[PDB]
Amino acid sequence: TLLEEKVKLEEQLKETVEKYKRALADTENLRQRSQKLVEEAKLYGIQAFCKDLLEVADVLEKATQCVPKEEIKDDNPHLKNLYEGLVMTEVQIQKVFTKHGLLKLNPVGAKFDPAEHEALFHTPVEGKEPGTVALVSKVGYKLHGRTLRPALVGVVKEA
Amino acid sequence: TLLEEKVKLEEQLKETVEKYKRALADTENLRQRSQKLVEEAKLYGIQAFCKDLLEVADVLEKATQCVPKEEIKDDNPHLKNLYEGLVMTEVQIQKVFTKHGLLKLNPVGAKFDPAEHEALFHTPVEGKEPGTVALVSKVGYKLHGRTLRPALVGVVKEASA
Amino acid sequence: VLLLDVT
Amino acid sequence: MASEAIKGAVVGIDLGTTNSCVAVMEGKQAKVLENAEGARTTPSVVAFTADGERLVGMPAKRQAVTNPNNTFYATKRLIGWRYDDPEVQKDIKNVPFKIVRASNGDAWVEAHGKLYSPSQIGAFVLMKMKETAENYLGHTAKNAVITVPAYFNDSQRQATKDAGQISGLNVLRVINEPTAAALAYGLDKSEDKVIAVYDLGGGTFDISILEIQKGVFEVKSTNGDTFLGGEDFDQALLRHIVKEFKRETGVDLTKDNMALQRVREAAEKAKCELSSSVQTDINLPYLTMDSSGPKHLNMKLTRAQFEGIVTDLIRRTIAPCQKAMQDAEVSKSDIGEVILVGGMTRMPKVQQTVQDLFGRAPSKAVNPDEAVAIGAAIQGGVLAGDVTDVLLLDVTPLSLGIETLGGVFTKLINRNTTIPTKKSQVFSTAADGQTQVEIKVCQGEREMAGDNKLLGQFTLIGIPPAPRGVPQIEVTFDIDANGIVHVSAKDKGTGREQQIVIQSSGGLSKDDIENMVKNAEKYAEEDRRKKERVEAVNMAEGIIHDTETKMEEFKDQLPADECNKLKEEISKMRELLARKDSETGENIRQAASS
C-alpha cells in the first residue's frame, strides 16, 4: 500500500527527469541549427553583394589602366589630379574588399590551379614552366577561401 | 520522516513538471525567434559592406562633379576617356546599390524627419516653410527601412521678426 | 548486406 | 520568503553616461542584442520636441542641433545628487539644457515647462532598451539587472532602482561595473584573490581593486581620472592629421565641415587598426576643393608615432592606479589578475603600461567594449534563470552514425550535440531481393566508413522480399543522459527489430576532442572529393543496373546496339581521373516502353 507510493514516486521522478533532460537538450540543438541558418543566410547575402561589386572594381581598374603613365605630366594638371584620385579610389576599394574577406587573385607566375585560375588560351612561352600563368587577362577574386570568380589567365604550353 | 520525505519529493516532482512546461514554452519561443532572425539576416546582413562602400560611392560622385566639364574635349583625348570611365563606374555602382535595396536619401524639400536626417544647422531661410530641408550637404543611404547614413541636411527656422 | 541511403 | 518563482527573462542593461547596452543569456553564453538600426550600443540621449515626443538614441542625437535646449545628454552625472552640490554646480554652466531644483532640493531637468528628474531620463533609456529586448526575444522582458559605477552610494543606487521600476522592469539587483566585468571574465567561481579592473576608453577612466574571497566580490578601492576618455585620443589623432595636412599642402581643415568628418572617421579607423599592425595608411581622395585643383590626403602612420602622440594621456592613468593600490593596502605582488575594460585597452601600449604598473599580464579574453553588459547578463541568468542546469548538460564528444552501401558514413548525429537526444532516419534495402541487412555503427568526423573508428556491428535479419528502394528501415539512435547510447534499428512495417547498448561513448575523454578535429579540417576537401566520387559511382551503378533490368525485360524486335552506352559508362567507372559521373548519367533511356 504505502510502499507502492515510494516505487510509483521514484519511477515517476526518473521518467520525468529523463523527459526534462530530453526537453532541455532539444532546445540546444535547435539553437545551434538556428545559428547555422543565420550564418548561412548572411554568407549568401554577402556573396550576392560581392558578385555585383566586382564589376565596379573591374571597370575602374580598366579605366585607370588604359591611360598611359607617360602623359601624366605637370603641363596636363587636369589628368594628373584625376589619375591620382582614381588610383586612390581603387586602392580604397581593394582595402574595403580585403577587410570584408573579398581577396584579389593575381597569380603572376604561379602554378595553374583549376580552383581559382581559368585557362583562356594555351600558348608556349619561353622562360616559363609548362602549366604556369604567364599572363593574366582578367583578375579573379576569392571569398573566405572559396573562389567567387576564377581568374582568366594564359597557360604556357609545350613547344 | 517517511511521509514528509515523500511529500517533499512529490513537490519536487510537480516543480520539475512545471519546469518541463517552461522548457516546451522556451523551445517554441526559440523556434519563432529563429524564424524571425533568419529573415532579418536575409533582408539585411550586408550592412557592414554597404556602410563601407558608401564612402567609395561619395568619392566617385565627387570625382564626377570635380572636372570643370569644359576641358573634356577632343583636344585632350585621354582626359575624355578617363572621365567617361569614371562616369561608367559611377552609374555601375549606383545600379549595384539599388539592386540590393540601397536607396539614396536626397530630401531636397521633404519634412525634417530625425530618423533619417542628421540636422547640421538651424539657419533661417526666407520663403520656405519651417521644418523642411534647406539643402542637403551630403546624400544619405538606406536599405530596407534600416538607414545606414543620415543625409546631412540643414533645416530652416522660423523668422525672428 | 550493406545498408543504403534514401534520397 | 520562499522561491520567488521569477520564471522569466533576465536582461542586463548596462546604463552608461553616453552609451548603453543590453544583453541576454542565450543558453550557455551571453549575447548582446542589436537595436532597430543594427548597432549594438544605444546612445543614452533623450530629446523632446515642440508638441510632445520622447525621441531616444540616434533619432535624438541627430535632431539635437535643431533642438539644443531640449536634448538631455549625459544625465547620469546628475542622478542622486542634490541641487547644491559642487559637481552639479560645475556641470550646470556647460550643459545647454536647463537644470532646476526640485521640491526636495534635488537636481532635476526641465523640458517645455515640465519637471524631469534624472531618474526619469534613465527610465526612458531603460524603456528603449526593454523595447529592444522585447523586439528580439518575442515576449516581455520583466526582470533586469542594471549596472552602476562602483562609487555609486546608497542614494544613487536607490535612484537607479527607482528608474528601473518606473520603466516597468523588475530590478533584481543593481550591480557594480567592476563586478559585472569580473563575472564576464569568469572570476565568479574562483579562489580567494585580489583583482584590479582597468576601465579606459569611455567617458571616464576608472580603476577598482576587487577581492574574490569566499566567492563574493568586495570592492577594496576605486580611483581614476574624470576628464580622461576615449574622445581625447581621437581628438589628438585628428589634430595631428589636420596639422600634417596643413604643413604638407597649406589648407586647414578646421574651416571645413564634411572634410573634418571624413578625417575623423579615417582617424578612428586608423586608431582601430593601430592595434594589430605596426603601420597604417590614411587615404581620403578629394578631401578638399581649392582654386588650383582638388587635394587628396595620403598619410602613413606608424605605431610609434601614435604612441608618442598620446603618451601623455596614457601616462595620466599612472597616478590614480597607484593611489588605488595604496588605499586598498595591496602591492604588485598581492594582485592576482588584471581585468581590462574599455575600447582603448586593445592598444599594446596601454597593456604594456598596465603590466608595468601591476606586475601582471592583463587578461584580454573578453571584448572590453561589451564586458559590463555580458557580465550583467551572466549574473542575471544565475540569479533568477536556470542556466547552471544547461552547464551540467554534457555534450557528445564526437559524431556518430551508420554505414552506407557505397562506403559513405551517414551523419545521423553531429559532433557537438547535447547528450539527451533522439534522432531517426529511414533507409531502404541494398538491392532487389535482399533479405539480410547489416548495420555498422562507428564514431568519427571524416566522411568515410572505416577511416575513423568502429564502435560495433549488428545485423537486422529477416526482410520480406521487395524491389530495391521499397523496404523502409528506421535506424534510430536513442542516446540517453550520461552518455548511454542506445543504437536501435527498426524495420518499418514488420517485426525483427535490433538494439544495442554500445559502450565507450566518449569514455576516452582526452585531447581527442581537439586533435581528431584538427586533422579533420585539413583533410576535408580531399575527403569531400572522394565521397563525391564514390557517390557518383553508386548512382552510376544504380542507373546501369536499372537500364540492364529494363533491357532484359524487352528483347523482341529490340535493336539496342546503339543503346550500348553501358559500355562507356563502365569504362568511365574504371577511371580514377574524372571529376564525377553525374554528367554522364544520361543512361535512363526507355524508348522500348516496357
Author numbering:
A (entry chain C): 59 to 217
B (entry chain B): 59 to 219
C (entry chain D): 435 to 441
D (entry chain A): 46 to 639
Paper text:
Thus, we mutated Y173 in GrpEL1 to an alanine (GrpEL1Y173A) and performed cryoEM analysis on a mortalinR126W-GrpEL1Y173A complex. Our cryoEM analysis of mortalinR126W-GrpEL1Y173A yielded two distinct populations differentiated by the presence or lack of density for the SBDα lid. We term these structures mortalinR126W-GrpEL1Y173A and mortalinR126W-GrpEL1Y173A−lid. Firstly, our mortalinR126W-GrpEL1Y173A structure harbors EM density for the entirety of the SBD, and similar to our mortalinR126W-GrpEL1 structure, appears substrate bound to another mortalinR126W proteolysis product. Critically, we observe a large deviation of the SBD in our mortalinR126W-GrpEL1Y173A structure compared to mortalinR126W-GrpEL1WT, with the SBD of mortalinR126W-GrpEL1Y173A translated ~6 Å away from the GrpEL1-B β-wing. Firstly, positioning of the SBD in our mortalinR126W-GrpEL1Y173A structure suggests that although Y173 in GrpEL1 is not necessary for mortalinR126W-GrpEL1 complex formation, it is key in mediating interaction between the β-wing domain of GrpEL1-B and SBDα lid of mortalin. Secondly, the presence of the full SBD in mortalinR126W-GrpEL1Y173A suggests that interactions between the GrpEL1-B stalk and SBDβ subdomain of mortalin are sufficient in stabilizing the entirety of the SBD. However, the presence of an intact, substrate-bound SBD in our mortalinR126W-GrpEL1Y173A structure suggests that interactions between SBDβ and GrpEL1-B stalk are sufficient to maintain the closed SBD conformation proximal to GrpEL1. We also observe that decoupling the SBD-α:GrpEL1-B interface via Y173A in GrpEL1 results in a change in dynamics only for the GrpEL1-B β-wing.
In human mitochondria, mitochondrial Hsp70 (mortalin) and the nucleotide exchange factor (GrpEL1) work synergistically to stabilize proteins, assemble protein complexes, and facilitate protein import. In bacteria, mitochondria, and chloroplasts, the GrpE-family of NEFs interacts with substrate-bound Hsp70 to facilitate ADP and protein substrate release. Herein, we present structures of full-length human mortalin in a nucleotide-free and substrate-bound state in complex with full-length GrpEL1. To stabilize the complex for structural analysis, we introduced a point mutation, R126W, into mortalin (mortalinR126W) that is associated with EVEN-PLUS syndrome and has been shown to reduce mortalin’s ATPase activity and conformational flexibility.
